[PDB]
PDB file of C-alpha atoms in Angstrom:
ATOM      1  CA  UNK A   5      -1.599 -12.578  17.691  1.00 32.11           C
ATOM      2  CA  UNK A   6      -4.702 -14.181  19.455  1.00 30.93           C
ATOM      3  CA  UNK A   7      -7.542 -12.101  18.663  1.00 30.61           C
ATOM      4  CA  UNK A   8      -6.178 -11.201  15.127  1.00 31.25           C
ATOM      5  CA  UNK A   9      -6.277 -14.464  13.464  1.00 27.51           C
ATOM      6  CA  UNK A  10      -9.409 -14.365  14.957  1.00 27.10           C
ATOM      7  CA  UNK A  11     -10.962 -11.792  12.545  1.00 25.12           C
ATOM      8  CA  UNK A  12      -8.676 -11.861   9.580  1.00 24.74           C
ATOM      9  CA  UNK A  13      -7.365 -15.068   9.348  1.00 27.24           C
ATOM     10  CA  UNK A  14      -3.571 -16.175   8.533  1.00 30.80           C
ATOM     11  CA  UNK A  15      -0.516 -14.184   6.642  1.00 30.18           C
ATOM     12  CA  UNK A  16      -0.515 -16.055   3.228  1.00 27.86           C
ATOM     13  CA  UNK A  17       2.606 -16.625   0.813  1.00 27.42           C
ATOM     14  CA  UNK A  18       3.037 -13.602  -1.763  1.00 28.02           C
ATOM     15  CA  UNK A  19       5.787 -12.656  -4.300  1.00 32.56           C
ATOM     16  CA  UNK A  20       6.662  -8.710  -4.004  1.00 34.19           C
ATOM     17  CA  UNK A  21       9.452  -6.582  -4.262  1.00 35.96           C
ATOM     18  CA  UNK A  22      11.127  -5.144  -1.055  1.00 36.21           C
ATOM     19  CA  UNK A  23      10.332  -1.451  -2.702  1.00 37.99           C
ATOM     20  CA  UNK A  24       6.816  -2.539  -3.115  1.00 39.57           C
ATOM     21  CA  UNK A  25       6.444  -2.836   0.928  1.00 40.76           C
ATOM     22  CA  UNK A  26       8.192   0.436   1.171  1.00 41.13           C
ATOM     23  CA  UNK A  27       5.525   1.999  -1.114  1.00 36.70           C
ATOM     24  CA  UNK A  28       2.667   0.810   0.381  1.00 38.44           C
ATOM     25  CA  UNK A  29       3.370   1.299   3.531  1.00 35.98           C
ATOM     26  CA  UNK A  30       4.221   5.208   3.039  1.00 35.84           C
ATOM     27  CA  UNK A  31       0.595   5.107   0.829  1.00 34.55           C
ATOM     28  CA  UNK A  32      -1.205   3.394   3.590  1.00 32.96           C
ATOM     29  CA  UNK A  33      -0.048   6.317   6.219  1.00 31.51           C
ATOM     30  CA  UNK A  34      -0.460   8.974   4.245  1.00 30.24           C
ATOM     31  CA  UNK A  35      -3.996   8.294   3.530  1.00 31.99           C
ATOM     32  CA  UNK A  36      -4.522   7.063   7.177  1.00 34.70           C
ATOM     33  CA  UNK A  37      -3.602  10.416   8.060  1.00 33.07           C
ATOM     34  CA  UNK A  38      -5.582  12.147   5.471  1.00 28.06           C
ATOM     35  CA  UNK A  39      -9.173   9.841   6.272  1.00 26.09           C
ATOM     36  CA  UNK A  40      -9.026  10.473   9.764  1.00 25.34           C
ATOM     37  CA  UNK A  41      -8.314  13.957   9.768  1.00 22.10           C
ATOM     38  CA  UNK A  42     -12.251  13.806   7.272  1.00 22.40           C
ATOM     39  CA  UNK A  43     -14.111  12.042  10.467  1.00 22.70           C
ATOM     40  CA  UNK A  44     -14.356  15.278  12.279  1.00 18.26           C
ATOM     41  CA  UNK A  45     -18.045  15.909  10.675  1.00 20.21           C
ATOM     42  CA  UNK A  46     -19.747  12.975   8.419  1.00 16.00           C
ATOM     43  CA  UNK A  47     -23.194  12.179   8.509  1.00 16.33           C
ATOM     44  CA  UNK A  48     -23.735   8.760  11.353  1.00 19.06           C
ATOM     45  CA  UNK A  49     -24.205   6.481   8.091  1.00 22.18           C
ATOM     46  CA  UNK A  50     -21.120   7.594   6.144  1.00 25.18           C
ATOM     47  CA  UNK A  51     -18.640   8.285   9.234  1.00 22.90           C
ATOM     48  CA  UNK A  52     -19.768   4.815  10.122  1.00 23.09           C
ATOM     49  CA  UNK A  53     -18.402   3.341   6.756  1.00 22.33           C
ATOM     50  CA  UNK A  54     -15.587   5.498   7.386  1.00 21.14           C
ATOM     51  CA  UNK A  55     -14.881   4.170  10.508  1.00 20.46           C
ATOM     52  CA  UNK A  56     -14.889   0.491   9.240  1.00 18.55           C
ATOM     53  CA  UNK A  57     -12.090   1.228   6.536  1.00 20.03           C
ATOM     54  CA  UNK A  58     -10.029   2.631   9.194  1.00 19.06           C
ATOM     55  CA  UNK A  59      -9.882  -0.717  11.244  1.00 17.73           C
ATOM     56  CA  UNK A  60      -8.905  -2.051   7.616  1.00 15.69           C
ATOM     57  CA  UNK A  61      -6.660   0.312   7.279  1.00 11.86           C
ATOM     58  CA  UNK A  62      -4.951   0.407  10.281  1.00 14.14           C
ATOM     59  CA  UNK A  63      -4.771  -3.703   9.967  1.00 12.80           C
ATOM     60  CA  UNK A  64      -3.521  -3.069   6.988  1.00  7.55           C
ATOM     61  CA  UNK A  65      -0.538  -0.975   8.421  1.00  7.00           C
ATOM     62  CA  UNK A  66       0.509  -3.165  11.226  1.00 11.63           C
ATOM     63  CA  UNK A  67       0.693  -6.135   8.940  1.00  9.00           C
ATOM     64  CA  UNK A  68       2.839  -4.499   6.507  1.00  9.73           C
ATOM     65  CA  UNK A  69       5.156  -3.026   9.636  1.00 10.89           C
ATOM     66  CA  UNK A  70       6.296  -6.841  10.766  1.00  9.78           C
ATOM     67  CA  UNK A  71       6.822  -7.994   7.425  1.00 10.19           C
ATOM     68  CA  UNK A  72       9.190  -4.775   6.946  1.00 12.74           C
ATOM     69  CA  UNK A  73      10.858  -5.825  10.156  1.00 13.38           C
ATOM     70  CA  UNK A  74      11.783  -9.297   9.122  1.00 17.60           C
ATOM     71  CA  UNK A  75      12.830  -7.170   5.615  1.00 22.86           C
ATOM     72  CA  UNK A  76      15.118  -4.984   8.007  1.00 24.67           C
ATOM     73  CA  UNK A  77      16.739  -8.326   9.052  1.00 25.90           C
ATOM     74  CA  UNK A  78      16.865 -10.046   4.958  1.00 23.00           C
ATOM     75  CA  UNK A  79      18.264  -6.859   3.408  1.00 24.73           C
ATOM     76  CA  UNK A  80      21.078  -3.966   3.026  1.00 20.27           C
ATOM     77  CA  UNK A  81      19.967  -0.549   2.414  1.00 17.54           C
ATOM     78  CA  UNK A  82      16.530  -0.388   3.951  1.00 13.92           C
ATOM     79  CA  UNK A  83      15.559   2.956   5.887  1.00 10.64           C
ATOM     80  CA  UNK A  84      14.068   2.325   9.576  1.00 11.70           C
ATOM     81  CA  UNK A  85      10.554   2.151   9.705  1.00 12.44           C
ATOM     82  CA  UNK A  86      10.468   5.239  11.652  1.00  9.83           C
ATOM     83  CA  UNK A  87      11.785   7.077   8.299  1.00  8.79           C
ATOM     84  CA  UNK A  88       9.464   5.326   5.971  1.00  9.70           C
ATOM     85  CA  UNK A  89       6.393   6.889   7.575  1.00 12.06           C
ATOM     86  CA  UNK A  90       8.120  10.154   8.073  1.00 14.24           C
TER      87      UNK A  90
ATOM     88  CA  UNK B  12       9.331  -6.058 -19.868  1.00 14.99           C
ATOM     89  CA  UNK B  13      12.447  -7.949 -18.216  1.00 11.79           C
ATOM     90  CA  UNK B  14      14.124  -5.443 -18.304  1.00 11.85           C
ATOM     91  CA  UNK B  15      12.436  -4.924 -15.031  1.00 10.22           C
ATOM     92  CA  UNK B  16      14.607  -7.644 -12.761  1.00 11.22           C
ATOM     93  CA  UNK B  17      17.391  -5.039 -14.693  1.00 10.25           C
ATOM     94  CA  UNK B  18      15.899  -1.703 -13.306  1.00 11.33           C
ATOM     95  CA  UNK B  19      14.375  -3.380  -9.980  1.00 12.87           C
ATOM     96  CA  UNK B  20      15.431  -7.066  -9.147  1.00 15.59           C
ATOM     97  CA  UNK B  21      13.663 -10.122  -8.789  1.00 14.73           C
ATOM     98  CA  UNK B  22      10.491 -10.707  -6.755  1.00 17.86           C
ATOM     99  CA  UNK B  23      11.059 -11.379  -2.799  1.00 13.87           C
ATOM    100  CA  UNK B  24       8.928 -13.688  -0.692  1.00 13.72           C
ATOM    101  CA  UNK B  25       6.614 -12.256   1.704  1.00 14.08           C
ATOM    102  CA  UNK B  26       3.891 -12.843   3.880  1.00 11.49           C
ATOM    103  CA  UNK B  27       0.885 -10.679   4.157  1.00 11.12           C
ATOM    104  CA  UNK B  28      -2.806 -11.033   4.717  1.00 14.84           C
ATOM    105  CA  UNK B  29      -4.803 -10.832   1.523  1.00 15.75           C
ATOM    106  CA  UNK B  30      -6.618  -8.277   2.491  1.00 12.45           C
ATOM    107  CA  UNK B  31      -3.479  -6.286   3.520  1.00 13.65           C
ATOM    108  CA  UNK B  32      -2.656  -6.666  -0.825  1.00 14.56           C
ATOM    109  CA  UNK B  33      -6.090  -5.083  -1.624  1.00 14.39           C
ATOM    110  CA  UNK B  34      -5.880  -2.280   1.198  1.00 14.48           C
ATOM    111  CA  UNK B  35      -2.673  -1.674  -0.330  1.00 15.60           C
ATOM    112  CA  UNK B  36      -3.660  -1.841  -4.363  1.00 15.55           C
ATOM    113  CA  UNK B  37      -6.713   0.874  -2.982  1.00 12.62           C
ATOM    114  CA  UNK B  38      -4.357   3.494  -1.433  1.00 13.08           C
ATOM    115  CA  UNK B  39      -1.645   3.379  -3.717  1.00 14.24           C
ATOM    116  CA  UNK B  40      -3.867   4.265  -6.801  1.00 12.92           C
ATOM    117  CA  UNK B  41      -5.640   6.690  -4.299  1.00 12.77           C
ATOM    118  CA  UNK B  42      -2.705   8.435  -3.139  1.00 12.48           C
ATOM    119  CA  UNK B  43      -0.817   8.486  -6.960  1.00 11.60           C
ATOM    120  CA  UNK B  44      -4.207  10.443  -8.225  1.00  9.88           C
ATOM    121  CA  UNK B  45      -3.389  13.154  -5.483  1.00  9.04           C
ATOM    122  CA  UNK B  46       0.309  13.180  -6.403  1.00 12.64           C
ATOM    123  CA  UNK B  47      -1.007  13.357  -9.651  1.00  9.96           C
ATOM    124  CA  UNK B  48      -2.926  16.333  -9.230  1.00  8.71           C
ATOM    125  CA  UNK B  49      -0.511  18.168  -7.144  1.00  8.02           C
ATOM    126  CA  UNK B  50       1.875  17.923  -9.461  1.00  3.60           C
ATOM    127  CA  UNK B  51       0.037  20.049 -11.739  1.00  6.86           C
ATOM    128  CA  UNK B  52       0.698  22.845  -9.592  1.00  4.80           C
ATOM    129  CA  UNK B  53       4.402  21.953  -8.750  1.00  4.76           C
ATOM    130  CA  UNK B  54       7.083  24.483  -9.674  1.00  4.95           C
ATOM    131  CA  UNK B  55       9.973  22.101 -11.761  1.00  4.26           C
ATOM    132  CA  UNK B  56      12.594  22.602  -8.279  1.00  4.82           C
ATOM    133  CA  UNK B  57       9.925  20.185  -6.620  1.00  3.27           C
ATOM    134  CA  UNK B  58       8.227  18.407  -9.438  1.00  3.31           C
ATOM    135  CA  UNK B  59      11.323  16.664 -10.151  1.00  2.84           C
ATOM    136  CA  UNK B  60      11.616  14.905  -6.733  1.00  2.00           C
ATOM    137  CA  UNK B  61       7.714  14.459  -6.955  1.00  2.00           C
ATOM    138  CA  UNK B  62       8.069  12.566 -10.719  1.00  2.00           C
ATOM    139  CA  UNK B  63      11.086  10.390  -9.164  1.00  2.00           C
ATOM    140  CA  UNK B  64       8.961   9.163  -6.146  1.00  2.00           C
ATOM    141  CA  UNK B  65       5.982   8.427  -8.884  1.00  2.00           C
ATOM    142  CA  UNK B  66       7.797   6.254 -11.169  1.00  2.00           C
ATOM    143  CA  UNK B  67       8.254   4.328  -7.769  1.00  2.00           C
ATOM    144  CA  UNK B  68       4.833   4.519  -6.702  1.00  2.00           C
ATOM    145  CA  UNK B  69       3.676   3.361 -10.514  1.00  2.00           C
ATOM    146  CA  UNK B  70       6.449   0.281 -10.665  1.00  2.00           C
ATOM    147  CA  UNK B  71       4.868  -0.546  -7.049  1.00  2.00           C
ATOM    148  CA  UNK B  72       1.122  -0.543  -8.461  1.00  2.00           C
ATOM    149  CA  UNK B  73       2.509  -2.434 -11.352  1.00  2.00           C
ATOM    150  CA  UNK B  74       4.183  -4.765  -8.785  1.00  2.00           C
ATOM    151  CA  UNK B  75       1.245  -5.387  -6.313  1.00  2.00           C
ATOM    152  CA  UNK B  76      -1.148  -5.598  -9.586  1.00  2.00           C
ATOM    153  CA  UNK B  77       0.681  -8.994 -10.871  1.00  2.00           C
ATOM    154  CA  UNK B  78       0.468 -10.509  -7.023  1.00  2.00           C
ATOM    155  CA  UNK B  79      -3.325  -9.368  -7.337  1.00  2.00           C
ATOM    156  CA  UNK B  80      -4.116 -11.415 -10.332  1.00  2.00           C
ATOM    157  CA  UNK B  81      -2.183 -14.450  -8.762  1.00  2.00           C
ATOM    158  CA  UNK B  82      -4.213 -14.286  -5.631  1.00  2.00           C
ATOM    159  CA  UNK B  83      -7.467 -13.914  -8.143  1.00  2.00           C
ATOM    160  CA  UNK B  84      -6.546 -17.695  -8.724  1.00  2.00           C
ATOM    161  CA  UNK B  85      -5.914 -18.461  -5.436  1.00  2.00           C
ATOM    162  CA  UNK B  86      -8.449 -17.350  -3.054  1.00  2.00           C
ATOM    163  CA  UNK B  87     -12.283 -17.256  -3.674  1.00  2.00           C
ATOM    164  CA  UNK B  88     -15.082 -14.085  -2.851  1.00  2.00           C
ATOM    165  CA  UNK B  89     -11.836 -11.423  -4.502  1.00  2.00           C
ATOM    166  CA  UNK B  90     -13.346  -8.273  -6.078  1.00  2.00           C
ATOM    167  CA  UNK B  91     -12.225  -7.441  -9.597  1.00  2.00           C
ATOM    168  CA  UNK B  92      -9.400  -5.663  -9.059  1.00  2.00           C
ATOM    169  CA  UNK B  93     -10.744  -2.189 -10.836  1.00  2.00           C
ATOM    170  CA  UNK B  94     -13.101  -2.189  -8.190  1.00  2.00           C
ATOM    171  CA  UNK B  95      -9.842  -2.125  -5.726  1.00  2.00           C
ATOM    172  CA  UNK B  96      -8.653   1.338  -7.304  1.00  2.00           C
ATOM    173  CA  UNK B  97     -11.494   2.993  -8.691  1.00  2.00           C
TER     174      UNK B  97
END
């Protein structure tokens, strides 16, 4: 992804377990959800800070989605993405 | 101890942006206080389910911790990693 490496640089080499990626990704939605549903109504300065985790977060997210499809591919027993988040 | 490769396996090999780890670290301790507190108003029928997916959720903290102080040694400008889930 052009524009990605861009502004955050490479993937790098970590040691995790595949329930570990199913965790975080499941914490990473639900307080995704639960941040953007507290924009509606912030003072410009703090919404603005706000804002800027989001893009973090939501970085966050789509990193940790291809790395659990390449999981869905290396293991047995792994729920669909489309169940993890929901 | 280990012990845990018993209960949970060995480590897998992933790759993730660093910043993905600490977005991570921040809203899994985030999102276990709320579980925390909700489970103080939990009848048992629910709690149970609730305690199951936190022992998860904790192992996953612990897990993502250890890859935290690796990358501490690996990568320089890193926060302390209370500042991560405070």
């Amino acid at each position: 992804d052009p524009l990605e490496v861009l502004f955050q640089g490479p993937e790098a080499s970590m040691n995790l377990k595949p329930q570990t990626l199913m965790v975080a990704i499941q914490c990473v939605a639900a307080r995704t959800r639960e941040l953007d549903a507290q924009l509606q109504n912030d003072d410009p300065q703090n919404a603005a800070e706000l804002e800027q985790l989001l893009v973090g977060y939501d970085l966050a997210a789509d990193d940790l989605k291809n790395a659990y499809e390449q999981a869905l591919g290396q293991y047995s027993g792994l729920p669909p993405y489309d169940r993890l988040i929901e």
